[PDB]
Amino acid sequence: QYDPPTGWLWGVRPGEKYQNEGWEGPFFYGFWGSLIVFAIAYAYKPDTSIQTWALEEARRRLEAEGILEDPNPT
Amino acid sequence: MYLSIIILPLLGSVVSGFFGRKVGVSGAQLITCSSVIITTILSIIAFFEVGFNNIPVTINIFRWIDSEWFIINWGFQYDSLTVSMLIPVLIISSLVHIYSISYMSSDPHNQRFFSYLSLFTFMMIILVTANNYLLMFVGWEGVGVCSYLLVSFWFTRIAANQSSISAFLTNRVGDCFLTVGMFAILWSLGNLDYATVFSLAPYINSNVVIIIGICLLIGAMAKSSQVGLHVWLPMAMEGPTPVSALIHAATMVTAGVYLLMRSSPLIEYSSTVLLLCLWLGAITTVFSSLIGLFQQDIKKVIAYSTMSQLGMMVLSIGLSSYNIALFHLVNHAFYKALLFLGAGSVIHAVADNQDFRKFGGLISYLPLTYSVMLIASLSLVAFPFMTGFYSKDFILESAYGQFSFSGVAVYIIATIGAIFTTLYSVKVLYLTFLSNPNGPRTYYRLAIDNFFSAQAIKSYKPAHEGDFFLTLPLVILALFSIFFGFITKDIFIGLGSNFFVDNSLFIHPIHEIMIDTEFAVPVLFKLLPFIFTISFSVIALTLSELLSELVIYFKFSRFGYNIFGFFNQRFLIEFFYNKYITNLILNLGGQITKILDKGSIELFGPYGLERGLVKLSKNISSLSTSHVTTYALYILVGFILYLIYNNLLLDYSYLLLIIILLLLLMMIGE
Amino acid sequence: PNITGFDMREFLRHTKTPTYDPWERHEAWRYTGRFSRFNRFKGALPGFGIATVAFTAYCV
Amino acid sequence: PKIPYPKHVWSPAGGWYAQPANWKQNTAIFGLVIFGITAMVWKYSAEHEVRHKMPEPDRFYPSRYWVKQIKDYERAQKEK
Amino acid sequence: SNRQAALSLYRRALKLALDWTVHRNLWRGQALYIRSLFEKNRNVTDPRLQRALLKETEKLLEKWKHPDPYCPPTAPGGSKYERNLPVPNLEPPPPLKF
Amino acid sequence: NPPRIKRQFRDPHADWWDKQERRNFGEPVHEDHDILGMFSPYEYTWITPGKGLFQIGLFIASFLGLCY
Amino acid sequence: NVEEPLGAAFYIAVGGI
Amino acid sequence: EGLQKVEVYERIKSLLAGFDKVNDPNNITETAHFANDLGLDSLDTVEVVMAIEEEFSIEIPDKDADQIHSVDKAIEYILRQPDAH
Amino acid sequence: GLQHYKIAMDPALVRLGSMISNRYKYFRWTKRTALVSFMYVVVVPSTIGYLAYKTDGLWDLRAKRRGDLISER
Ligand SMILES: CCCCCCCCCCC(CCCCCCCCCC)(CO[C@H]1O[C@@H](CO)[C@H](O[C@@H]2O[C@@H](CO)[C@H](O)[C@@H](O)[C@@H]2O)[C@@H](O)[C@@H]1O)CO[C@H]1O[C@@H](CO)[C@H](O[C@@H]2O[C@@H](CO)[C@H](O)[C@@H](O)[C@@H]2O)[C@@H](O)[C@H]1O
Ligand SMILES: *P(=O)(O)OCC(C)(C)[C@H](O)C(=O)NCCC(=O)NCCSC(=O)CCCCCCCCCCCCC
C-alpha cells in the first residue's frame, strides 16, 4: 500500500491559505519580471565581443594561406 | 539519437525527483526505468552505428567556457571507445533499475532513490561522451556527488554518513591531481580537447607528458580505488545493494580505467606512466584478494573483488594493451553486477543479515540465486570458456607475453591474486549455500513440518526466493556471463582487428606484445591459472566440511592470529589514515583556532593593544591632579627640555628615544 | 602460569563434536536430511547432470 | 510495516509513501512532456550531428533516416 | 559485584569462540570446555582471589579478541541499525512566523 | 575539562538522553566536543601503531623478496 | 485518496522551456 | 503484524526443551521460573539467554540479562523489542 | 527580535560556546605557545615564500616540443 502525498507547502495548513507579506509583488513582478524581460531583450542585443570581431579578421588571414578555402577566388 | 542518449536519463531524474509527489512511486519508477531502457536501446544502436561502421559522430551544442586560447565546448564525440563504454553502463543501469522496483519496494523514500540512480546514469554518459577533459570532469564530479548521495541515502545512520564523507573526500584528493593535470594540459597546449591533445602529443616535451600522466594516474587511482586511494570503495557498501551493483561494481569505479584508455594517445609517449600503471594494478590486485578472504561481510568481499579486477584493468593498461582492459572492463561489469545482485537477493531472503557466520544450507532455499552466483563466480575466477575467462586470463598471458622483468614479475604478483580470488569465491559460495546452517530457525523453518499449533498461518518465513522484478535481471545477467565474452572476443582482442581505428585506443608499434603473447608463451604458463584454480578450489572445499580443523588451528595459532587480523583490518591502512592524516588535519585546525586566531593574533594585535593602551592612558591621566603648582612644574620641565633639545643641538634620535622611553615608564605601573 | 586453568592447546584439543552435550536436541536439526553432507551437495552443480547426457547425445 | 512520519512535511520528491490518486494521469502528462522535448533534442541532433564518413547503402544504419548531413548525401549521390 | 561480572564474561567467552570458529559443530565442543573452567573455580571464596581471577580472564578475552565480532543487523553496530529512523517529534510546529 | 575520549567507547546499550550520540543532557563536554562525538573519525583499536607499522613492514619484506 | 494538482511549478518549468 | 504472544511461546518452548538438564518437558509453563520451577542453576540460565538471543537474532545487553530469570519475563522482553524477527 | 522555537538549551553546550567565544582573553605568552606562534606565522610562510622566490620564472610549459626544456632559468 501507498500513502497519499501530504505536507504543508510554505507551512500553510489545509484549512488556511498563504497570506502575502508585502514582498511578493515587488519580487515577482519587479525583480524576476525585469530579469525575464532583460533576458529576451538580451537576445536582440548586438554582438560586441572581441572574438567575433577577431574571428572575422583571422578568417581572412587564414584565407590568404593554404587553410580555409575562401568562397571567392578574387 | 546521439543527443537523446545524453539527455533522456536526465529527464527521468528531474521528474522523479522534483515532481515525485505528482508521479507517485510507480509513476516515478515507470518514467525513470523507461528513460533508461529507451536510452539503452539507442546506445545499442549507436554501437552498430559507430563501431561496426567506423563512423564517429561529433555534436557541438554551444560553448561552455570561452577565455582567449581556451575554448571549452558543451560538445560530444562518439567513437569506438565511447559506444563500447556505454554498453555495460546502460545495460546494467537498466537491470539495476528493474532490480530496485522489488528491492526498495519497502523503503519509504522511493522517488528520491530512483531519481538518484537515473542522475548517476546521466553523469556516467556525460563522462564518456565528452569532447574534452573538462566536460569529462563534469561527469566525474557528478558521479562523485551521485555516489555520495546514494552512500548516504539512509542519512539517519551515522555509519552511512562517515562512509559518504570518505567517498566524497577521497575522490576529491584524486580530482585535485586531475584538476592540476588539466592545468598542465592547458599550459602546454592552450586547450584540452581530445583532438588537439592527442594529435600533438608525440611532438610534446617528454617531461611534461610525464607530469600530465602522473596527475592522470593519481586521479584515476582514486575513482578506480587503486592501492593508495582505495579506502572509500569498501565503505561505499553502506548504501543500498542496487547502488553497490551499478556504481561501486560496474560503472563509476571503471571511470578511472576509462580515463587512461581515453588518454592512451598521450600516455603511450611516456613509458614511465605505463610502468607505474603496470605496478599500481599488480599491487592492487593482490592487496585486494588478500583482504577479501578475511572479510566477514558478503558485500565487503564483493567490493574487494571489484578492486582486484580494477587492478587487473590498470595492470593491462601498463602493458599498453588497452583493448584487453576495455574487454575486461566490459566483461567484469556483467558478472560483478550479477554477484552483487545475486548477493542482494541473499541479504533480502534472510532478515537483511550480511554476515557469513549466519548463512549455510540456503542452496535448497535459493536455487536460482545459487545458480546465478555460481555462474558469476566461474566467470570471476576465469573458468575456461566463460565470459570472464577470455578477458582476465589474457591479461595474465600478456603480462608474461611482455618479455620484461616487470611483466614476468607482475605475472607472479597477479597469480597469487588469482589464487586468493578463488579462495574468497569459494568462501562466498560455500558459506552461503553449501555449508551447514549457521543462522537461526527462522531462515530455514519450512512449512512441511508443522512445529506450530495455532499460528500455522504465519511465522514460517523460510528465506524464499525473489519475485519477477528481482530475478529477471539475474537471469539476463547470467546469459552474458556464459556467452558474451566469446561472442565479442574478436572485436576487442582479435589478432589484427580494426575496431578502434579512429585513434580511440592508441597502441605504439614499439612495445606491442600481441603477437608474442599468442606465440612465445609456453603452453604451461597459458594454462597455469586454470590448474591453480581447480587445485586451490578443491583445497578450499577440503578445508571446510572435509577437514575444517586446520583453519581453526590456524586462527588460534599465535602467528596465524596476527595475520588474520592484519588482513581482516585491511592492511591496517585505515587505522594509519585516521590518526596520521585526518586527525592530524583536525589537530592542525585546533592549533590555529585556539592558539593563533583566538590567541596570539588577538594578543599581538587588537586585544593586546586594547589592553595596554587603556593601561597607558590611565597612567597619563594620573599626572592630572588639577594642582597649579604641579602643572607649573610640568610647564617648567617642558620649557627647559625644549631649551635642551635646541641649544645643545642633540640628535633627533635621542628625542625619539626619550619619548618612547617615557611611554615605557608610563606603561610601567606606579 | 595462567592461574585460571585455561590452556590454549587443551582448548584446541576440545575442538570437535562432543560425545555428549546438554544441547543436541536443539542443535541436531542442522545436521539432518535437508542439511546432510549428501543432500547439501546434491545440487552444488545444478545443471551438470542434464548437460552431460545432452552432450553425449550430441557427440553420438 | 510502515514507518510513522509527520503529515505536515512537504517534499518535492513526495515524502514517505507518497502515491497520488491520479498517479497514472500525471505520469501520462509528464511522459508526454519528456517525449515532447526529447523529440526536440532529436530534431536538433539530426541537424548538427557531423560525420566525416558515409555509411554504405547496404548497411544497417538507422541514422540514415533522420540525420541531414548524410540524408542529403544519399540524394546527392543519386544523380548520375 | 564479583557475581554479575563473572556471568558476563561467560557470555563474552562463548561469543568469542563462535566469532572465531564459524562452524556450530566445533564451537559446541569449545563452549562445553569453557563451562568446565567456570565450574572448576566455583568454590573460590576469598574476594582477593576473586578480583584477581576475574582480571586475568579479561586479558584472555582481549588476547584472542576477534578483529570484527558478529553483530545482528538491528543491533548497535549492525548493518541495518539506525537505517530508517523515524522523526522524534511527530507533532506539527506551533504557529510561529519567520 | 572531562577526560578526552571519543564517544565511540561509551556503552551503546546504556540509557542515553541522546541514544544516537550516546550522551546525557546535562553531561559536561570537552573543549573538543565537536571532534569527539559519534559522527567523527572512527578510532581503530586493533593494535598499537608501533606493532601496526611492524606488520606492514613484513609485507614489504615479502613483496621485495618475490622481486629478488 | 486525495488527488494531486500538477501545480504551478509544472507550468513554470514547462512554460519556460 | 509483529511478534505475537502465541508465536514467542511456542518458539521458546521448543528451545529450552533442547537441554538434557531440565527436570522434564512437562514442567515448563508461561510462568515457569528458571530455578525454582524447572531445573537449572546459576551458570545454565545464562546459556539460555545466549541461545534465546541467537534464535531471535537480537542482542541481550548485560544489564538486562540478569532481570530475565523466568519464562514469562522472556516472553514479555521479546515483545518489548521490535527488532525481533 | 521575533520569538523562535523552543530549544532544549544544554547548559554544558552553552557554556562551551561561551568559553570558546571568550577564549581570547586568557591567552598568554608561554614557552610552547611562542613556538607554535613562531612556527605557523613566521617559519611556514617564510619557507613557502622562499621557495616561491627560488622558482619564479624557472619553468614554462607553453609550447615545449621535444628538443626544448621546461626550464628557462
Ligand atoms: C608528482 C610528480 C611531479 C614530477 C613529475 C616528473 C617531473 C619531471 C621533470 C622535472 C623537471 C621539470 C619540472 C617542472 C615543474 C613545473 C610543472 C609542475 C606541474 C604543474 C603544471 C625538473 O627541472 C628541474 O630539475 C632540477 C634538478 O636538476 C633543477 O632544479 C633547480 O636546481 C637549482 C638550479 O640552479 C635551483 O637552485 C633549484 O631551486 C631548482 O629546483 C633544474 O634542473 C630544474 O629546474 C625537469 O627535469 C629535467 O630538467 C632538465 C633541465 O633542467 C634537466 O635535464 C638534463 O639536463 C642536463 C643536466 O642539467 C643533461 O645533460 C641532460 O641530458 C638532461 O636532459 C634535468 O634537470 C631533468 O631532470
Ligand atoms: P553460577 O555458576 O553462575 O555461579 C557463579 C558463582 C556465584 C559461583 C561465581 O562464579 C563465583 O562466586 N565463583 C567463584 C569466584 C568467582 O568470581 N569466579 C568467577 C569465574 S572464574 C572463571 O570462570 C575462570 C575462567 C574464565 C574463562 C577463561 C577463558 C575465557 C575465554 C577465552 C576465549 C579465547 C578465544 C575463543
Side-chain angles (χ1 to χ4, degrees), chain A residues 1-73, chain B residues 1-447 451-452 454 456 459-669, chain C residues 1 3-12 14-15 17-60, chain D residues 1-79, chain E residues 1-47 49-98, chain F, chain G residues 2-17, chain H residues 1-23 25-46 48-82 84-85, chain I:
Chain A
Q1 295 297 322
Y2 294 103
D3 308 351
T6 190
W8 310 338
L9 191 43
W10 321 139
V12 306
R13 310 185 181 169
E16 300 175 35
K17 279 178 292 295
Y18 171 86
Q19 292 294 110
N20 267 31
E21 296 190 312
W23 63 267
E24 289 91 346
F27 206 74
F28 294 138
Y29 301 154
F31 177 86
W32 263 109
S34 64
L35 286 173
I36 320 166
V37 176
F38 170 70
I40 297 89
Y42 176 71
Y44 291 82
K45 162 162 180 65
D47 204 343
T48 47
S49 73
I50 193 63
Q51 293 82 18
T52 61
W53 183 93
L55 276 296
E56 293 179 354
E57 185 53 41
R59 179 57 74 51
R60 288 179 282 269
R61 312 259 190 112
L62 299 171
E63 270 163 12
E65 290 175 354
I67 302 92
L68 273 158
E69 307 172 353
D70 50 334
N72 297 115
Chain B
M1 185 186 318
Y2 287 93
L3 275 189
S4 308
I5 283 165
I6 293 154
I7 193 66
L8 195 39
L10 173 59
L11 282 71
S13 64
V14 170
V15 171
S16 190
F18 291 126
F19 317 93
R21 161 168 299 259
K22 286 83 195 177
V23 290
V25 191
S26 62
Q29 294 161 337
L30 206 58
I31 295 196
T32 46
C33 298
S34 315
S35 299
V36 180
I37 301 299
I38 288 174
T39 310
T40 311
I41 295 303
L42 312 185
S43 48
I44 303 145
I45 300 187
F47 197 89
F48 293 87
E49 294 293 328
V50 178
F52 283 118
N53 293 296
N54 194 32
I55 314 167
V57 64
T58 301
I59 313 96
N60 280 316
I61 296 90
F62 63 92
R63 66 201 210 293
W64 181 20
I65 306 160
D66 189 359
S67 184
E68 195 227 28
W69 270 107
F70 310 156
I71 187 65
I72 295 90
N73 283 335
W74 297 99
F76 300 96
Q77 174 82 27
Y78 287 66
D79 60 309
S80 292
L81 193 53
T82 292
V83 295
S84 178
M85 185 64 72
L86 281 171
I87 293 314
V89 176
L90 275 297
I91 289 186
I92 296 282
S93 179
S94 280
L95 300 163
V96 171
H97 268 76
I98 301 309
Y99 197 83
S100 292
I101 306 169
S102 161
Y103 193 93
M104 299 286 276
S105 49
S106 182
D107 184 89
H109 320 302
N110 190 359
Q111 288 70 241
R112 181 173 35 110
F113 181 73
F114 271 86
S115 72
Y116 282 176
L117 282 72
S118 192
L119 176 62
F120 174 75
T121 297
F122 175 70
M123 296 301 178
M124 258 287 133
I125 308 168
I126 290 303
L127 198 155
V128 293
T129 54
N131 276 326
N132 50 329
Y133 283 109
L134 206 49
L135 183 50
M136 174 277 299
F137 189 76
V138 165
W140 193 274
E141 296 310 90
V143 294
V145 178
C146 302
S147 78
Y148 154 89
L149 276 171
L150 282 166
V151 179
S152 46
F153 183 69
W154 294 313
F155 56 75
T156 65
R157 177 167 161 87
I158 288 169
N161 271 270
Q162 293 179 356
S163 309
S164 70
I165 306 280
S166 179
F168 185 82
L169 290 187
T170 309
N171 278 174
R172 271 292 187 110
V173 174
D175 304 339
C176 172
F177 296 77
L178 186 45
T179 294
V180 160
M182 305 192 270
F183 286 160
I185 289 174
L186 278 181
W187 196 352
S188 61
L189 277 297
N191 219 43
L192 60 83
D193 289 330
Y194 293 153
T196 74
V197 172
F198 303 153
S199 53
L200 290 155
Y203 315 98
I204 297 169
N205 196 269
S206 69
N207 272 327
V208 305
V209 178
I210 297 169
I211 298 168
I212 287 159
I214 288 309
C215 276
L216 294 174
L217 210 45
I218 300 299
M221 182 179 72
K223 226 163 216 70
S224 290
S225 81
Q226 301 300 305
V227 72
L229 301 166
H230 64 272
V231 304
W232 70 279
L233 175 69
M235 293 180 183
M237 303 301 120
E238 287 294 329
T241 307
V243 174
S244 300
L246 179 55
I247 315 185
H248 322 113
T251 64
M252 184 212 181
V253 287
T254 72
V257 188
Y258 164 78
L259 181 83
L260 310 183
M261 280 196 286
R262 163 63 69 216
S263 308
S264 57
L266 183 138
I267 69 175
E268 266 292 273
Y269 295 106
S270 88
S271 64
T272 289
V273 307
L274 300 161
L275 182 86
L276 294 174
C277 276
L278 188 153
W279 280 84
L280 183 63
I283 294 187
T284 301
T285 182
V286 62
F287 179 98
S288 311
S289 280
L290 288 158
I291 291 173
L293 177 66
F294 296 76
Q295 299 302 307
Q296 314 298 317
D297 185 288
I298 177 160
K299 293 191 59 189
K300 280 298 194 63
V301 175
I302 319 194
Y304 268 112
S305 63
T306 306
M307 181 177 149
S308 189
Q309 300 289 271
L310 274 173
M312 278 285 104
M313 282 157 224
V314 179
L315 177 148
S316 185
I317 284 167
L319 294 156
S320 306
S321 66
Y322 316 88
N323 50 315
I324 322 174
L326 188 63
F327 192 35
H328 191 237
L329 188 153
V330 166
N331 287 186
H332 177 253
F334 284 123
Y335 65 68
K336 191 51 58 79
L338 177 60
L339 268 170
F340 256 130
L341 293 187
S345 52
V346 169
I347 296 89
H348 177 79
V350 303
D352 278 17
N353 186 62
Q354 279 144 222
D355 202 318
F356 289 124
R357 294 172 280 188
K358 287 301 154 312
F359 300 143
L362 283 156
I363 178 168
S364 54
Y365 297 83
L366 306 160
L368 183 63
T369 299
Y370 171 75
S371 179
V372 304
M373 291 199 63
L374 169 65
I375 298 156
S377 298
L378 294 174
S379 35
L380 176 61
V381 300
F383 198 84
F385 308 143
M386 291 270 294
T387 288
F389 161 72
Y390 290 77
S391 285
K392 183 191 53 172
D393 274 1
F394 188 56
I395 300 143
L396 275 72
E397 313 156 18
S398 292
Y400 182 76
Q402 172 179 318
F403 268 88
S404 307
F405 168 46
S406 294
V408 178
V410 307
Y411 173 105
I412 306 302
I413 301 299
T415 199
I416 302 102
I419 285 148
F420 280 83
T421 291
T422 310
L423 300 178
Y424 67 60
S425 294
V426 160
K427 170 189 200 181
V428 173
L429 214 50
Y430 166 70
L431 275 176
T432 301
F433 313 89
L434 298 191
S435 86
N436 265 289
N438 282 342
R441 290 285 187 180
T442 49
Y443 297 166
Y444 311 107
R445 210 192 296 125
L446 283 164
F451 205 72
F452 279 93
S459 71
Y460 273 126
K461 55 179 75 67
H464 63 307
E465 271 273 10
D467 71 320
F468 162 74
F469 275 147
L470 183 63
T471 64
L472 169 72
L474 289 181
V475 194
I476 287 295
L477 273 180
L479 302 176
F480 280 76
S481 313
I482 309 179
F483 308 103
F484 178 80
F486 176 88
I487 319 171
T488 64
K489 67 181 178 67
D490 217 333
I491 295 89
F492 305 92
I493 296 317
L495 193 150
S497 76
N498 49 1
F499 201 74
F500 317 89
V501 297
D502 49 356
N503 195 14
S504 193
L505 289 178
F506 172 69
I507 47 170
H508 209 271
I510 46 177
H511 37 56
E512 172 264 348
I513 60 182
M514 185 64 72
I515 190 167
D516 282 22
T517 301
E518 208 154 336
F519 291 143
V521 172
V523 190
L524 182 136
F525 281 170
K526 267 171 145 169
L527 189 147
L528 201 57
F530 179 45
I531 289 300
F532 272 71
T533 304
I534 291 297
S535 68
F536 270 106
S537 50
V538 292
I539 287 189
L541 268 296
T542 304
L543 282 191
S544 307
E545 205 181 335
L546 269 178
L547 284 168
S548 183
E549 279 83 316
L550 292 91
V551 62
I552 300 307
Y553 283 67
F554 187 89
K555 290 201 251 171
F556 279 112
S557 66
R558 189 76 252 166
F559 161 66
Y561 172 92
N562 296 115
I563 75 168
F564 192 102
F566 183 77
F567 293 129
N568 189 357
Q569 291 306 291
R570 307 153 299 270
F571 280 67
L572 313 179
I573 300 298
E574 308 186 302
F575 161 61
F576 285 99
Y577 267 34
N578 296 115
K579 67 182 291 294
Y580 284 112
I581 300 301
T582 191
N583 282 145
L584 188 153
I585 281 288
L586 260 52
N587 296 115
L588 289 176
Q591 309 267 54
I592 315 172
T593 72
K594 300 180 295 208
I595 307 164
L596 274 299
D597 271 350
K598 293 177 192 308
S600 59
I601 299 276
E602 283 292 3
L603 184 66
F604 181 69
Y607 182 66
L609 269 163
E610 187 256 350
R611 193 145 65 91
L613 266 186
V614 168
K615 182 62 65 68
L616 175 66
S617 62
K618 290 206 297 287
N619 295 357
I620 313 161
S621 296
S622 159
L623 293 189
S624 299
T625 55
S626 195
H627 202 223
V628 55
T629 72
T630 324
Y631 281 179
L633 182 54
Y634 294 168
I635 287 162
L636 177 59
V637 171
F639 169 82
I640 62 170
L641 264 176
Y642 277 42
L643 309 189
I644 301 299
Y645 186 63
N646 191 0
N647 199 351
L648 286 180
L649 199 47
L650 307 175
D651 194 18
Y652 63 92
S653 70
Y654 294 132
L655 192 142
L656 275 177
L657 183 63
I658 301 299
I659 288 161
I660 308 157
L661 187 153
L662 291 164
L663 314 177
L664 314 193
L665 294 174
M666 186 70 69
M667 263 294 318
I668 288 311
Chain C
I3 62 170
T4 187
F6 177 36
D7 189 358
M8 175 51 91
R9 68 180 65 252
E10 265 293 86
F11 178 63
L12 183 62
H14 273 215
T15 300
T17 61
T19 61
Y20 164 70
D21 197 76
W23 268 118
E24 293 83 3
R25 317 225 314 284
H26 161 73
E27 294 294 328
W29 75 264
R30 299 183 135 105
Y31 322 98
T32 55
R34 179 66 65 192
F35 312 109
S36 179
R37 186 179 295 275
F38 173 77
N39 296 115
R40 263 182 297 143
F41 284 86
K42 184 166 75 174
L45 315 185
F48 195 110
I50 297 169
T52 316
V53 169
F55 187 62
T56 301
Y58 160 72
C59 194
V60 184
Chain D
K2 199 146 291 170
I3 310 305
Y5 56 93
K7 312 292 164 306
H8 73 259
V9 169
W10 196 95
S11 179
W16 272 263
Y17 295 84
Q19 180 141 298
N22 50 327
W23 81 261
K24 293 185 194 64
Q25 187 206 196
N26 304 66
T27 297
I29 293 176
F30 271 104
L32 269 288
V33 176
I34 282 161
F35 173 100
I37 62 170
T38 306
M40 293 180 183
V41 176
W42 201 291
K43 182 175 174 66
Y44 169 88
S45 196
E47 215 275 332
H48 318 67
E49 278 154 5
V50 65
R51 307 165 160 72
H52 312 257
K53 182 67 181 294
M54 295 298 102
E56 293 294 335
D58 199 20
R59 176 58 72 87
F60 168 88
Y61 205 83
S63 296
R64 288 190 308 173
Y65 301 145
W66 50 84
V67 67
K68 171 171 179 282
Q69 190 252 317
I70 73 175
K71 185 177 179 180
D72 275 331
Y73 174 83
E74 197 155 356
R75 85 174 182 182
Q77 276 284 110
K78 187 62 66 68
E79 187 267 328
Chain E
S1 75
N2 301 321
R3 191 196 173 273
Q4 307 300 323
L7 294 174
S8 182
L9 298 205
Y10 183 59
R11 318 181 49 191
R12 291 180 50 181
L14 304 182
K15 277 190 63 180
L16 185 68
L18 197 45
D19 286 336
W20 267 114
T21 81
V22 180
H23 311 143
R24 299 195 44 113
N25 281 298
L26 278 296
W27 163 73
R28 194 78 250 182
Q30 279 150 36
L32 183 63
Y33 165 63
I34 301 299
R35 179 182 162 80
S36 64
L37 295 176
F38 278 76
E39 189 67 31
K40 187 174 182 178
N41 288 176
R42 176 185 294 276
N43 297 340
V44 180
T45 307
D46 180 35
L49 271 297
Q50 292 193 359
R51 272 201 290 262
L53 193 54
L54 277 196
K55 194 158 68 66
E56 208 54 46
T57 185
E58 186 173 0
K59 280 190 280 185
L60 273 167
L61 287 194
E62 187 194 67
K63 182 69 175 177
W64 307 97
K65 62 169 180 174
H66 206 263
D68 65 324
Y70 161 89
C71 199
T74 60
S79 305
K80 192 196 246 199
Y81 162 62
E82 293 179 353
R83 167 177 294 190
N84 272 115
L85 279 168
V87 298
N89 197 337
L90 277 296
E91 275 77 1
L96 262 53
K97 272 73 180 182
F98 301 101
Chain F
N1 213 0
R4 193 168 180 287
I5 62 170
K6 299 298 293 295
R7 202 172 304 121
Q8 166 187 352
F9 305 113
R10 298 190 188 172
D11 187 12
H13 296 118
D15 291 331
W16 297 115
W17 169 77
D18 202 339
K19 185 183 287 185
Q20 263 200 306
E21 274 322 290
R22 307 213 194 130
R23 191 194 171 263
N24 312 106
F25 180 61
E27 211 161 0
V29 287
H30 197 275
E31 77 203 89
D32 294 1
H33 171 76
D34 56 342
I35 60 150
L36 285 177
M38 292 310 299
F39 187 16
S40 67
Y42 188 77
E43 182 65 26
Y44 293 87
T45 182
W46 175 238
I47 52 184
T48 293
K51 186 180 289 293
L53 287 177
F54 187 54
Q55 300 214 3
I56 293 143
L58 271 295
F59 176 74
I60 299 171
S62 177
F63 190 79
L64 294 188
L66 268 296
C67 179
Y68 187 56
Chain G
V2 193
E3 204 196 353
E4 259 290 319
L6 279 181
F10 174 86
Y11 306 113
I12 295 162
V14 161
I17 299 176
Chain H
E1 203 262 329
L3 277 296
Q4 295 298 109
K5 182 62 66 68
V6 72
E7 273 197 29
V8 176
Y9 189 13
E10 197 165 8
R11 183 177 292 171
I12 190 167
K13 168 176 72 178
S14 299
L15 169 59
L16 73 165
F19 286 103
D20 303 342
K21 289 185 160 180
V22 298
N23 290 318
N26 298 313
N27 224 319
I28 62 170
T29 42
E30 293 179 353
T31 55
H33 286 220
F34 292 168
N36 299 358
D37 291 331
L38 61 83
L40 294 174
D41 63 358
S42 62
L43 183 63
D44 265 348
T45 187
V46 65
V48 193
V49 314
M50 205 176 340
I52 276 289
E53 70 178 356
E54 181 268 337
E55 60 96 10
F56 279 61
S57 75
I58 62 170
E59 192 178 5
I60 301 299
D62 63 358
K63 67 182 290 294
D64 272 10
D66 305 327
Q67 291 54 36
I68 190 167
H69 82 93
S70 307
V71 161
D72 186 74
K73 294 181 176 67
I75 300 295
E76 61 86 20
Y77 182 76
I78 295 299
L79 289 184
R80 263 176 38 191
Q81 265 67 63
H85 175 256
Chain I
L2 59 86
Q3 65 183 357
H4 55 90
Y5 282 120
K6 296 183 289 294
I7 299 295
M9 275 303 195
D10 197 334
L13 272 63
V14 304
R15 102 183 62 191
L16 184 50
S18 78
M19 183 278 288
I20 290 163
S21 179
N22 289 305
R23 190 182 174 92
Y24 72 99
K25 323 205 163 83
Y26 303 97
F27 170 87
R28 293 163 300 134
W29 283 124
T30 61
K31 182 183 64 175
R32 68 182 294 274
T33 300
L35 271 295
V36 191
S37 287
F38 179 60
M39 271 321 281
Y40 299 168
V41 170
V42 176
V43 163
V44 178
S46 298
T47 312
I48 283 173
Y50 168 91
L51 277 296
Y53 191 88
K54 299 298 293 295
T55 57
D56 193 1
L58 184 46
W59 297 305
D60 185 33
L61 260 54
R62 183 73 208 142
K64 304 308 189 72
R65 293 180 179 91
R66 292 177 76 257
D68 204 349
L69 297 173
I70 303 179
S71 198
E72 293 179 353
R73 179 152 39 76

